[PDB]
Every structure is written in C-alpha cells, then in structure tokens.
Ligand binder design. Sequence first.
Ligand SMILES: C[NH+](C)c1cc(NC(=O)CNC(C)(C)C)c(O)c2c1C[C@H]1C[C@H]3[C@H]([NH+](C)C)C(O)=C(C(N)=O)C(=O)[C@@]3(O)C(O)=C1C2=O
Ligand SMILES: C[NH+](C)c1cc(NC(=O)CNC(C)(C)C)c(O)c2c1C[C@H]1C[C@H]3[C@H]([NH+](C)C)C(O)=C(C(N)=O)C(=O)[C@@]3(O)C(O)=C1C2=O
Ligand SMILES: [Mg+2]
Ligand SMILES: [Mg+2]
Ligand SMILES: [Mg+2]
Ligand SMILES: [Mg+2]
Ligand SMILES: [Mg+2]
Ligand SMILES: [Mg+2]
Ligand SMILES: [Mg+2]
Ligand SMILES: [Mg+2]
Ligand SMILES: [Mg+2]
Ligand SMILES: [Mg+2]
Ligand SMILES: [Mg+2]
Ligand SMILES: [Mg+2]
Ligand SMILES: [Mg+2]
Ligand SMILES: [Mg+2]
Ligand SMILES: [Mg+2]
Ligand SMILES: [Mg+2]
Lengths: 209, 294, 112, 159, 169
Amino acid sequence: ARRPARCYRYQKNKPYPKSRYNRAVPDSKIRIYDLGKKKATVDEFPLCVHLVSNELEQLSSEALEAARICANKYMTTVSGRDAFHLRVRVHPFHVLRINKQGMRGAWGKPHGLAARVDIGQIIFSVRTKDSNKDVVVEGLRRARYKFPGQQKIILSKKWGFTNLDRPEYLKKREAGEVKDDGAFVKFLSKKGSLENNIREFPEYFAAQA
Amino acid sequence: QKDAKSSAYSSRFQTPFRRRREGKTDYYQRKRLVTQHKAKYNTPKYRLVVRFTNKDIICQIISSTITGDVVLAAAYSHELPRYGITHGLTNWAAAYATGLLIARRTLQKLGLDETYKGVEEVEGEYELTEAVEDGPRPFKVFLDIGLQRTTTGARVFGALKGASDGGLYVPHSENRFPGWDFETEEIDPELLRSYIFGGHVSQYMEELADDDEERFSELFKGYLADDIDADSLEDIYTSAHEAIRADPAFKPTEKKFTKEQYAAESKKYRQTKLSKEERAARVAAKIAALAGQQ
Amino acid sequence: SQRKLQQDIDKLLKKVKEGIEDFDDIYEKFQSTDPSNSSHREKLESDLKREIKKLQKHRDQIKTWLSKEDVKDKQSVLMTNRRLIENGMERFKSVEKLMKTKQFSKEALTNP
Amino acid sequence: GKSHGYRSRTRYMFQRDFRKHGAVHLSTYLKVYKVGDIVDIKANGSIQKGMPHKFYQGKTGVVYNVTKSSVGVIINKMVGNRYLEKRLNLRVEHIKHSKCRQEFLERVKANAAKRAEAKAQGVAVQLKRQPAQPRESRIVSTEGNVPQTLAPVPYETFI
Amino acid sequence: QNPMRDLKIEKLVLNISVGESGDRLTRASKVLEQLSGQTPVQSKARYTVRTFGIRRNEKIAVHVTVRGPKAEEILERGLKVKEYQLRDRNFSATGNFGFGIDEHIDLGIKYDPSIGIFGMDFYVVMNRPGARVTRRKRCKGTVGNSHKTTKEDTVSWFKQKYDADVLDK
RNA sequence: GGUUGCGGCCAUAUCUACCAGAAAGCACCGUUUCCCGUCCGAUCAACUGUAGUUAAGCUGGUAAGAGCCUGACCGAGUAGUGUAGUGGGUGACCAUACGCGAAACUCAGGUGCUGCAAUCU
RNA sequence: GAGAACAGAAAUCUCCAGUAGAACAAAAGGGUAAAAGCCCCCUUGAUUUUGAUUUUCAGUGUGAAUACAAACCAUGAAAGU
RNA sequence: AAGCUCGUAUCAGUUUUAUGAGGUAAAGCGAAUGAUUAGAGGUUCCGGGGUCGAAAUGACCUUGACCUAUUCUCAAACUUUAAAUAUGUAAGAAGUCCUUGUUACUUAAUUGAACGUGGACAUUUGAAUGAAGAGCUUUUAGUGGGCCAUUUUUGGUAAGC
RNA sequence: AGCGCCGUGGCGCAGUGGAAGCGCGCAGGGCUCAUAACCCUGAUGUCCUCGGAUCGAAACCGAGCGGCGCUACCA
Ligand SMILES: C[NH+](C)c1cc(NC(=O)CNC(C)(C)C)c(O)c2c1C[C@H]1C[C@H]3[C@H]([NH+](C)C)C(O)=C(C(N)=O)C(=O)[C@@]3(O)C(O)=C1C2=O
Ligand SMILES: C[NH+](C)c1cc(NC(=O)CNC(C)(C)C)c(O)c2c1C[C@H]1C[C@H]3[C@H]([NH+](C)C)C(O)=C(C(N)=O)C(=O)[C@@]3(O)C(O)=C1C2=O
Ligand SMILES: [Mg+2]
Ligand SMILES: [Mg+2]
Ligand SMILES: [Mg+2]
Ligand SMILES: [Mg+2]
Ligand SMILES: [Mg+2]
Ligand SMILES: [Mg+2]
Ligand SMILES: [Mg+2]
Ligand SMILES: [Mg+2]
Ligand SMILES: [Mg+2]
Ligand SMILES: [Mg+2]
Ligand SMILES: [Mg+2]
Ligand SMILES: [Mg+2]
Ligand SMILES: [Mg+2]
Ligand SMILES: [Mg+2]
Ligand SMILES: [Mg+2]
Ligand SMILES: [Mg+2]
C-alpha cells in the first residue's frame, strides 16, 4: 500500500468528486482546517503570510494534514498557541483511484482524496502580529518540505485574512464603517436601507471619534 | 410577519404574462382562438368578445394583429337606453339586444345589410344562419366568453343567440340555451321566448307585488318612478328590437369639455416623480433627522 | 446449459408433485385421525411438517430459478407449483396452530 | 450499451431559457410564412409535437409547403460526398423567420430607390457594397492634447 | 377609519371526525343533518395509519359549512354551551377561531335514542367586506395590509360583542 | 392624459412596507322568483344599479429597499483561446509573435412602453 | 406556519405563505401552473384507405415518429383538438 | 477508362458584411442543486443535559439542531452568465416594381395563394478573391490488418500500452 | 479476485404485501418428602445495518458489515 505522490502528482484526470455516482469512498485524514486563536479579530492580527504554489499539481490530504501538524507544532512550541491564526485554503475533493486479469475492467476503486492546486493559489494562510513574522516564516518553511513541488512565502499586506490593504483598512476603521463580527468584520455599503444601516453602524452616522 | 421572500427566490422568479398576472385572459384559450389555419395566410379570426361588468355589458368584434388586437364594431349596454331599455341594463334581455345590436352594426358596417335580415319574427327557436345561395357567405365570428363558466342559461349565450338571430354565423349548439331539459334533451321554445321578452323579470315583479310591497319597492323604485307596469315589459323589449333593426348606427356622446381640457384640468392630482437631486436631498434630510445614537 | 437446466427443472417438478401427493395423504389421515389417538395426531403433525419443510426447500429453489436462472419457457408451471406449495404451507399452518392452541390460553379465552 | 435515440444528447439543446419557461407567445403564433420563404429552425421544447431532429437545430432552410399548423422546410445536409435535400414538417413554434432575409429585402428596396434617383438626375449609380477600404490622410491636433509618456510598470505582487 | 370594513362571519364549519365508517359515520351525518338543517359532506382519508385504525380512501369524517344568520345562531348556541369564555390559544393568528364541544345534547335537539353522542368542532372564519377580490375568478388579487383580520381584531370583536372574556395570555 | 374592453413585447412591468386617488369608469356591494351550480346563492348562475363605500381591488408615488434592465476606457485587454517557432524548462507548465476575447466584481443610471376602440372635468 | 373535543409527531377541518422545491406507470434527461398535474362529465381517433417525410441509413429493411389528403366519428358553446 | 452535353453568367476544404444556432474552456456559489470550513447574532407554548427548583405557556447556564447576515474551498454525469476555434443561410435576371388573367383552393368580399400575360429596371446584374474548363453518365480494378507527429482527450502508476 | 448462499427470541431454524412463529430453553403455579419427568399457564425479538418504491413489509429493490461454499484452468 501507500503509493507515492510521485504517481499521484500531476492533474491528469477530470475532477472526480464524491457524488451520487461515486459512493463508498474513504474519508480524508484532514478534519480541522483553522487553528490557533481562531476566535481572534483582524483587529488583533494585522499581518498576513501566504504559502502559495508555483506548480499545477495535486496535493494529498495526507500532505495537507502532515504539513498542518508540523507547522502547528512549531508555532505553538515557539510563539505560543494564541499568537497566530492558521487557515488551510485547499480542500481535498478529488477521489484518486487505484487499480489493484490484465487491463480488462481496469476502472479502479477509490483510494484517496486530493487538493487540485493551481499556479498562484493559496495553500496556507497565517495571520499574526508584526513581531511574529520570523516564526510564521519558518513554520511555513517546514510546511514547504512536507508539500511537494515549489512554493513561496509572500508577505501579504492585507489587514488580516480579509481584503483591503493596510492604509485602506485603517481609513475604513477610523471612518467607522467596519463592525467587529466573530473572527471577521462587516462593512457599511451605501446601497442598503437607511433604517437598518442606522441600527447596524451607529458610529458612522454619529459624530463620534 | 417574517415571511419576506429571499433575494435568490426573487431572482429565480419568473413573472407571468401581464394579462395573466392581472388575471384577465386565459392564454391557452386565447391561443386556440386566434391561431389561424396557415394556408389562409391573412384571414383574421374574428371574435365576438362578450364581457360582463356589474353595471354594463361589453360586446365587441375583435381581430388579432401582431401590433395588438383591433376592433371592428362595439356595442354597449349603457348605449341601449338610447334605444329602449332605461332599466335592466345587465339582464338577459339587454344581453340579447346587445348581441342583436352588435350583429346589425357589424353587418351594416360591412355592407351585408340588404341580405341576412336575421329573423324579425323572434320566437325562441334554435336555428343557424343558412348561407344564401348565389351570394356572400354569412360573416363568421367565434364566441369569446373569456373566463366565466359555460353554464346553461347565461347572458353570454344570450348575446350569442342575439348575434345568431341578428345574422352573424356563429357556430353553436342548443344545449346551453335556457329550457334545455337534459332529461328530455330538447329545447323549450315557449320558455326561451318568454325569457326573450323578459318573462322572468315580469313574474318576479308580479310575485313581489302580490307578496311583499316593501321589497318590491326597494328593488324596483325605478320601475315605479317610470310607472312601467308589470306587463308592458314585452312591449318595451319588442319596441327596442325594432329600434335596433331600424338604426344600428353608432352615435357618439356630445363630448363636452374636450380632450385637451380633459388632459389638462381633470388631473393635476397625479403626484409627479422626483429626480436624483431631490432623492439625494431627501436622503440627506433623513440622515440629519436620524443623526445620533437615539 | 439450457438442456441441463430444464432437466433439473423437470426433476424438481416431479419431486414437488410426489411431495404434494404424500402431504395430501398425511393431511387426510390427519383429518380422519380419530382424535382420541393424540399420539397419532402428533405423529402425523411431525410427518407433514417434514414434508412441508421439503416443499420449503423446493419452493426456495423455484424462487431462485424464477429470479435469476432464465427459465425461458416454463414460468407457468413453476408458478403453479409455487402456488400449490404455498396452499400446502397454509394448510400446515392452520393444522399446526390448531393443535398448538391451549384450551385455557389467553387467546382462546379472548376469542373462540 | 450504446444509444442513438431521437433526442439523444439533447439535454441543454431542448432546455428552455432561464426565466423563459411556460407558454410560447402569440407573436410566433401569428407570424405568417408563405411558400418559398427562408426560415430558421430552432426547436421549442415545450411543444413536443412536430419537433425537429437535433441535427436541424439552428438551421436555415426554404419553406416550400404550408399547411394547417405546420410548414415544410427544405434543408441541405452533408452525408458522404454529397448534399441531400431533406423535407421537414415543422410547427410554427419551432420555425422562425430570417432577419438576414429581411435585411436583404430592405437592401434591395434601397437599391431600387438609389438607382431611381441616379437615373432621374443622371450620374453616379454606385450600387454595390464595398468592403472596408484603407483609412485616408488625417490631421491630429496637439492643441489641448500633449502626448503623455507611458512606461511599463514594475512587478508588484498583489497577493 | 371604519367605513364598511366591519368584521362579519364568512362561514362556520361543523366537523365530526368519528374515525371509522358505517353505522357511526351515518349517525354523525344524521346529527349534522338535524343540527345544520343542511346536507353534510363526508370526508375521506388520505393514507393508512396502523395505530389510528384508518385506511386510505375510507370515509372518516363529516362536516357542514353554514353561512349567515344560521351560522350566527349556531355560533351563539356554541358559545352558550361554552359559557362565553374562550382561550387565547383558541383564537388563531389569522383571526379565525374555533373550539370543540363534547356531548352535543347541551344545545338544541334531544338525544334521539337511535343516533348517539357526538362531540364536534366549531371553526369560524371571519372576513371583512371585500374578500371576493381573492375568491373570485376573473381579476384575482390579494387583500391589503389594512385587512387580513388579525388576532387583535377578532379578540376585540368577540369582547366588544357577546360580553365574552379570555384567558391569561 | 385618467379609466374600461381587447391586446403586443412579457419584471424598466415583479416583490416587501407605507401614502394618496377630483370626475367618470371599474370594483366592493344589495337580492334569490326564474335559467343554473354548490355541503354552503362563499365561487358560479340570475335580478336590481336600487340601499352604501373608496375600506380593499385597481392606478400612481415614496424607499441611500430587494430583484430586474442598460451602459462603462470598472475589473480586463485579465482568464481563456486559433495559428507559429530546431522558443524556455528534467518536467509540470510558461513566455513571445500574429489574432479574437469573456464572466463575476465595481461604479453610474432607470423602475414599464405601446396599439385598436369607447368614455371622462 | 397559525389554530379546532377526544386527536398526540402523523386521522379530519380552516386560513395564510408557497415559480413548482409536487405530480405526470417505469430508467434518466427535458417539458408542463386558470396545465401536460388533481377532481368531475362525455366518449373510443388505440378507427378506414393508401401515399409523402424524419431518425438509424446503403438515404435499404424493421421499429418509432412527423405533417397532410379523402371519409367516418368523439368532445366542446365554439375556435379547435 | 470510355466518354457525352455545353463552353452560355458556374462553383469554391477561402474571406467580408448581415443574420442565426451551440453550452465546451473560463467563470460562479454573500445565484438554483449537491458538497463543504469557521466563528457571530437569535428562536424554542417545541431536542438532550445539569442548576434554582414541588411544579408552572418558570428562571440560569451547557450542548445539539432550525433561521438570519457573513466566511474558506469545489463539481464529467451542477449552473445565472459565457467565449476563441469550428458551423447554417443570404448577398438577385430563376431578381425587383406596376397592371390585370386562371382556379373546382381560400376569403364576408376580385380577398389572398400559386402560376401567368403585357410594360418598366441597369453605369456595377447588387461584397472580395480565384477559376486550372463547367455539368452529367456508364462501367470496372484494387482496398475494407494500418501506423506515426502536433494539439484536444478516455482507461491505466506508467508504457515504444 | 469473481460467483452464489446465509444473517429472525437466549440456541438451532420457518416465514407468500395487510405482517412474527416452531422446538428446546426462561419465568409462575401444581404433583412429589425433595429433584427431574409430567400437568396448567405466561413472557421473550433493534427481523444484520442504512436508504428507497409501495397506502403499507422481515419479505420487493438497492449500498455496506459479518460468516460460509464453488472456481481460479492450458502452458
Ligand atoms: C458576355 N457573354 C460572352 C456571355 C457570357 C456568359 N457567361 C459568363 O460570364 C462566363 N461564365 C464563366 C464566368 C466563364 C463561368 C453568359 O452566360 C452569356 C453571355 C452572352 C449572353 C448574350 C445574351 C443576349 N441577350 C438576350 C442579352 C443574346 O443576344 C442572346 C440571344 N437573344 O440569343 C443570348 O444568347 C444571351 O441571352 C445569352 O445566352 C448570354 C449568356 O448567357
Ligand atoms: C450577375 N450577372 C453576371 C448576370 C448573371 C446572370 N445569371 C444568373 O445569375 C442566373 N440565375 C441563377 C443563379 C441561375 C438562378 C444573368 O443571366 C445575367 C447577368 C448579367 C446581365 C447583363 C445584362 C446587360 N444589359 C442590361 C445591358 C448587358 O450588358 C447585356 C448585353 N446587352 O450584353 C446582357 O447580356 C444582359 O442583358 C444580361 O442578359 C444579363 C444576364 O442575363
Ligand atoms: Mg375554457
Ligand atoms: Mg439553449
Ligand atoms: Mg404523442
Ligand atoms: Mg384545462
Ligand atoms: Mg424507417
Ligand atoms: Mg444563356
Ligand atoms: Mg455566420
Ligand atoms: Mg455536453
Ligand atoms: Mg471549468
Ligand atoms: Mg460566471
Ligand atoms: Mg452552490
Ligand atoms: Mg438574359
Ligand atoms: Mg469497390
Ligand atoms: Mg469491396
Ligand atoms: Mg418450571
Ligand atoms: Mg419439579
């Protein structure tokens, strides 16, 4: 057993997901996808760090869980559990097949589950404070070893996971059109109703600081 | 009531046709009515459209065109009191007189008046307008009831019998005229004729005048105002029929306070729309009113 | 092969018919037991139980035949022998219940 | 195992358009087709009687026969090394006119007109269409428009 | 204001669900005949329930719809045997209400020894003048938001009228 | 220009919540002898236009409304793609040359138009 | 969703919302809302005479289907089907 | 191969203009179906626990579901949208306009339908380019094991499969 | 690996669309000095699990779990 990712590496087949035509597939081994202080705010975590791909390939659900475990262990041993929020941004939806006389009836049974990653696609995202840039970089360097192919750390200059580069987001915050939700934020748009906009963003519609 | 419908529902929602949505046409019935045999290429299928409001009977001859339906002739129960019927504008007698009026009006307009005189000896008997040999075939129209039920003894079938007795070749059967006893499976000429000259309204008048005075007065204050006795109803309906046979010409109203005055003075009461600057001004006024965390 | 299949058909056909004959003989001797011989009643019960169990095995074979085996001609005679076996089954069930029922059991005290 | 039915592989072909289900309208019931006309075949899935095959979907032909509720359309189809003429009997829901043909009629009416005044005053008929000819010499004004200079941008990653 | 938008009883429905067929259902149909003075209609089941002892397409219940002064006087007798107290449950959110009585000899006819005891459901729907706009055929519509009787409108109609009271909620 | 009858395109027309509607017209409305239909004159049928009411329907307007529609040099000449190379790269794939070219997003604007006939301060 | 004796999670009745999230004998995919669904009424056109056309295709056969013509009928007030 | 009828306005493995048709690539999921990550706010006359409890259409907290507004990622047998490339038709003389002849068809009707007579229309006879002749028939051979390359693509770990 | 069968009370087994039984065990009473045997009774089930068709099944149709049996040959 345990055929290599070198023979399940490239994207050769069409996406073959779990559906009503394909049942009795084994479960993925990755079950948790967000990690660290996942209830924190983008207020608390300004800097984003992205592990991105350079190859059009397939990532095993095993490679995802192993990279997540090693990265997690490194950041908790160094910087503690609450200093980061790590989210894996690929979900294994590909049922890989195994054949297991001759080539007659060669259509194979389900064997796995894979994340088809494109060039320039986020694999790992870590949001953290400005002082933990080093430790999140070396944790994602450990992640780059359990993951096949070539990957890059890009210092994402978006405030947290969201959008909206840091001066733009600072301007939005000091304008007051940003409301703190659970692990995310809500934005004021100039297209909704006046009454519900009033009752959901009082600070923009007041003379507050 | 927290039953507001979602954006996905409203996006996937297909609205019906306009007339279906306001519930005025059956497009199934209308398609089967107005679809023409394609080997005739130009012949419009003419519809004797009969409609009943609470105080009027509308009876038109309509042909179908790509730009919209066009009319050839119209007759109105509120134009019937010009002829002879000042009371009972939505009875079965006014329906028959309106069908007779629309038939005579459309044949007079078409120039088919010297032939196809109709009956002139109305007797409550079922017959079809036979084609005159060596001459034009009778004008063929089809009854458009619309949405009302096709029950036996209906005013729309009265307008049907009126157009048939006028001279329009409308195909019809006799199993929907009043007096068609299905046990005997024939027609009743006396009952049909009595109801032609309004025997039902008459016998209601004498039954009320015998039994209940206050009720009779309440339902027929107009009849007592005109001093029309209970047995001249056939007389006035007959005289209406030969007035229809005499002058089937559309006379418009006197049309006082003409069309430009109607457009100008009658309604400045429709409240006009605003523009972008006014809408923004109202928005800013509402921001100023709702300013603060109150 | 279809010839071998139809041969096994005809064999089980004949076995079912002779089983039906001897089951009917045991049934009529049961109804004419002279029921003072209760031991003879019980003995005839056990004998027709054995015969109806043999008919159970034959009927299950007929089930598999009519389900999957492509009988291809004789569904009529297979169904008729199935119906004969099942009416024998219900006769055995009625007889078997009749002597099962205890004279002062709650079912006989509720409804005669 | 393998199927070639009358409506095989016609799923999205005979689907209705989004928010265009229901009854088909009286414009396409009241349009008139006469013998020799040019029509486009696009099947309507709601009317199952008189449907074309999937091959004739989106196909232009000449109507040669008209009857009670359908028209007969002539279609040339390629089988083997030759075209074969096919006579389809199709309902007017599946039949639609040809805007290219109507534009040819407005063009021939315009051409007859143009030759009429060209003959009336006696010069410059010039009826036939010409393709897009090369552009001619022009003068552009720098007054109010000084050419602003452009440079390639550096490589900045946005993610 | 209140020009002619005054609540009136559209219809009153008398429903008896005996649960089986034959003698009891025939006698219940008879009860509805002498009570309403009007032919009842027998309602049929929709599917089988083992515990209920009912079968699909087997005649289970029987009901009458009455309207007008007869509906008003049957309603008055029902409130008289319910002693003019009804429940805030017993007053639905679309304004229509109803109750259930047992041993129907408390109102009207005597026992008629060949028929029996039949408890029964009163249900009453209230409408304001102008529900033809949603019940008629040509040019259908929906009533406006200053319409569609609410719980408040009906509870007040039953308190302004009849000198009746309600319970806790 | 309002309204009615018949319609064409079938949401710029729909949906939600309020407000207004002179006149006329629709509408709600009043009644059960007759034709007719229902468990029920509620629907339908018939009769009256009388006893009344714009409360609803309908029409129109409002809403930093939802939806829908139109446009943008907004995204984006991006994704994708036809053709070409003894181009690059171990490969996966990626640039370049001659061409075509989106969708979502964002922003701005709009919220039925119209035909035949009749009628209306 | 809100209600009504026994009656409850599910019996019957009533109202509101409900673009189809149901049903249309069966596989799946299309289609259908004053219907193609459900209920009721009447029927036998699931009839006769042969031709033409479409699919598979050799433009042969079989099967299935389409549009007519000449009759005779069914239904509906009728257009029609 | 034999040819035959004409060389007399015919046709293109082509483009343009105009008009259709398609549901792949892409995209989308705070759009339908199906899958799926994470919190937030709520609702229980109506899930399971505990606490204050005698219980209560009582109260507090815990955990599950249901709803609302969000979020992460997807679909050969999902889709609002939607290419590029390929694909159908038309670009006239067998055409257009005017007038009036036939009919047992059609129309209420000399109303239309189809085919016509007699006139009018040209400078280009109605886009480009090229035609090497165009069209038609008869008869008969061999063949009916294929293989490779670019690109698209299915099964397979892959294969000179 | 394929094919086929089986799965029901504590154990061995029947069971057809209106729907759960046989025998031995188990429980209570009796008989006997007592225990068996015998007599009179009573109770006993997630019908292997999950989903679907049906107005409804353990049965009909599908997915897996578990246990058996047959074939796996020519070199
Ligand atoms: C110019 N000439 C050489 C010509 C050429 C062609 N065809 C071509 O264009 C050539 N075809 C190619 C392009 C090569 C395939 C042509 O097709 C013709 C003609 C001539 C005409 C002459 C016609 C004429 N009238 C009636 C205008 C005439 O005098 C007679 C007559 N009354 O007998 C004709 O024969 C004429 O009608 C005719 O047949 C011609 C052509 O068809
Ligand atoms: C398009 N041109 C090339 C053309 C084509 C065809 N033929 C067709 O298209 C045939 N139609 C089919 C396709 C078969 C249905 C044509 O038939 C003709 C013509 C041209 C004209 C030229 C006429 C012209 N007259 C008006 C003065 C002319 O110069 C002469 C002449 N006096 O020599 C002609 O020959 C002319 O009168 C004529 O006959 C033409 C055609 O017939
Ligand atoms: Mg109808
Ligand atoms: Mg399509
Ligand atoms: Mg059919
Ligand atoms: Mg119908
Ligand atoms: Mg064939
Ligand atoms: Mg020539
Ligand atoms: Mg094209
Ligand atoms: Mg496809
Ligand atoms: Mg894709
Ligand atoms: Mg998209
Ligand atoms: Mg989705
Ligand atoms: Mg010539
Ligand atoms: Mg050969
Ligand atoms: Mg050969
Ligand atoms: Mg014992
Ligand atoms: Mg003992």
